[PDB]
Amino acid sequence: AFTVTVPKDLYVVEYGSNMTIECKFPVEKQLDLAALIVYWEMEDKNIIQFVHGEEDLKVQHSSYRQRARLLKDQLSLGNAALQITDVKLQDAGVYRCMISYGGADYKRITVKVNAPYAAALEHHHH
Amino acid sequence: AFTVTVPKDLYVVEYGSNMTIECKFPVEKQLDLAALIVYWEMEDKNIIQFVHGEEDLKVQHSSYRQRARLLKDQLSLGNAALQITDVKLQDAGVYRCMISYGGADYKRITVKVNAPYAAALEHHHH
Numbered sequence: 001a002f003t004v005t006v007p008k009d010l011y012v013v014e015y016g017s018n019m020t021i022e023c024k025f026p027v028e029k030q031l032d033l034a035a036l037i038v039y040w041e042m043e044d045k046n047i048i049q050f051v052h053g054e055e056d057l058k059v060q061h062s063s064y065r066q067r068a069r070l071l072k073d074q075l076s077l078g079n080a081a082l083q084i085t086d087v088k089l090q091d092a093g094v095y096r097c098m099i100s101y102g103g104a105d106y107k108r109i110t111v112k113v114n115a116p117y118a119a120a121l122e123h124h125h126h
Numbered sequence: 127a128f129t130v131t132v133p134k135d136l137y138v139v140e141y142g143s144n145m146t147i148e149c150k151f152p153v154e155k156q157l158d159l160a161a162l163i164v165y166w167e168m169e170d171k172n173i174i175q176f177v178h179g180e181e182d183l184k185v186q187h188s189s190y191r192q193r194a195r196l197l198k199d200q201l202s203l204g205n206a207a208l209q210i211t212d213v214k215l216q217d218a219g220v221y222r223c224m225i226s227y228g229g230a231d232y233k234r235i236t237v238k239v240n241a242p243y244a245a246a247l248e249h250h251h252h
């Protein structure tokens with residue numbers, strides 16, 4: 001019974017920091033990279049689309065350009081880790097990691113962003 | 127390039143009526159029912175989970191119990207049609223049909239529900 005799991009369903013991160021959001025999927029010893037599809041989104045925004053052992057940045061939402069990456073090292077360990085660099089207040093929301101690997105499933109992850117006045121003020125007027 | 131498509135991304139339905147929400151996926155001549163995964167949800171509520179040629183009502187959200195069904199006749203024609211009977215105001219929302227069939231994709235469908243005063247009054251006072 002194919003299941004994606006999340007060690008943490010909540011992340012509290014500081015504006016300006018890097019975060020790694022993780023989800024696990026069952027890998028039995030050896031990864032079948034051909035069959036693997038990893039897809040990250042927040043609300044409805046495409047972050048990552050890993051298919052046929054390669055990311056597809058053509059479909060990636062502009063706000064996550066050059067600052068969103070899948071950690072391919074961890075994929076062998078059944079960990080689809082999404083790193084977001086330079087976290088903004090816009091990154092606060094519900095993420096979804098959708099994985100297909102024989103079966104298919106997804107999990108939700110809530111991200112809260114703490115920001116000082118200055119950063120908040122700018123986001124407020126936007 | 128595996129793609130789910132929706133003829134209509136918006137449905138306006140009357141309280142008390144039945145609705146059929148549709149998604150298409152490419153079927154090349156013959157359906158491989160073993161590989162097919164169809165999954166319907168509305169705002170994170172599980173409606174349908176079709177896998178290994180069979181629905182799984184164990185994970186189905188209670189509000190869609192006995193009144194939500196996948197049209198299996200149309201699956202061979204690459205049409206994952208979700209029928210909801212006796213539409214309520216609670217059914218208004220964003221639906222997602224997630225399909226895995228070799229590749230994987232999903233589409234969003236917005237449903238609006240028109241209801242008379244009486245039905246609205248009852249929904250208003252949850």
Ligand SMILES: COc1cc(-c2cccc(-c3ccc4c(c3)OCCO4)c2Cl)ccc1CN1CC[C@@H](C(=O)NCCO)C1
Nearest residue numbers: 039098099100104105106107108165224225226230231232
């Ligand atoms: C068979 O069960 C499912 C199946 C699919 C499911 C079905 C079909 C396709 C895809 C999928 C795969 C990759 C993609 C993609 C879509 O579109 C493009 C990007 O790459 C998924 Cl994912 C989805 C869900 C479930 C069931 N889960 C288990 C409980 C519940 C859950 O975990 N909720 C979240 C809790 O935080 C729903």
Ligand SMILES: [Cl-]
Nearest residue numbers: 006007008022
């Ligand atoms: Cl996590």
Ligand SMILES: [Cl-]
Nearest residue numbers: 132133134148
């Ligand atoms: Cl439709």
